[PDB]
Amino acid sequence: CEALKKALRRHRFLWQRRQRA
């Protein structure tokens, strides 16, 4: 019902992608 146990490194990286687009 809580915590998806899948949104920590998955996201932090989802955005990062590339430094200074």
Add this chain to the structure above:
Amino acid sequence: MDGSGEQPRGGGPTSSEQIMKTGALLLQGFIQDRAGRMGGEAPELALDPVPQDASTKKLSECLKRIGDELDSNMELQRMIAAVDTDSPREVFFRVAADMFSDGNFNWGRVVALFYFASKLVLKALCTKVPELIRTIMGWTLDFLRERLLGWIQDQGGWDGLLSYFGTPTWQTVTIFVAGVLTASLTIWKKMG
């Protein structure tokens, strides 16, 4: 500047004016309604202060009643979590297409669209990007103003929608907007 008056003549009252308005409204509601956090100054859902007519108010409760229930489904909720995000413009158009790819150009799938987008709207609200929120609502009014417009116009406006949600055991409605939308998520990709 008066011309002749305000609101000439044109068979079909429920024109697009009353529709387009209820388009950016209803949604704009169910949005800052279930996600509208308390004590959150400066809402990201800027547009309309509050709904005037109660016509939308009642229709808004329908999205809140089903939302609280549907959102309580670990099944559909899980599927949405299995659908990685890398292109809301591609998938959105893809899933939105799968909905009524052959069904029967019905319209019920529409309701599901609002819920499906809700995730992209609220989901993006946490990502820290309110821009996507406004960009999303655009895809709605666009599709509605480029589609449902013709059909919705022949349905007597959004009234036909509420007129439909007037059957017995609703357990059939939740199995419709889900069996149709869910399927789209089933084909898209089945990974776990």
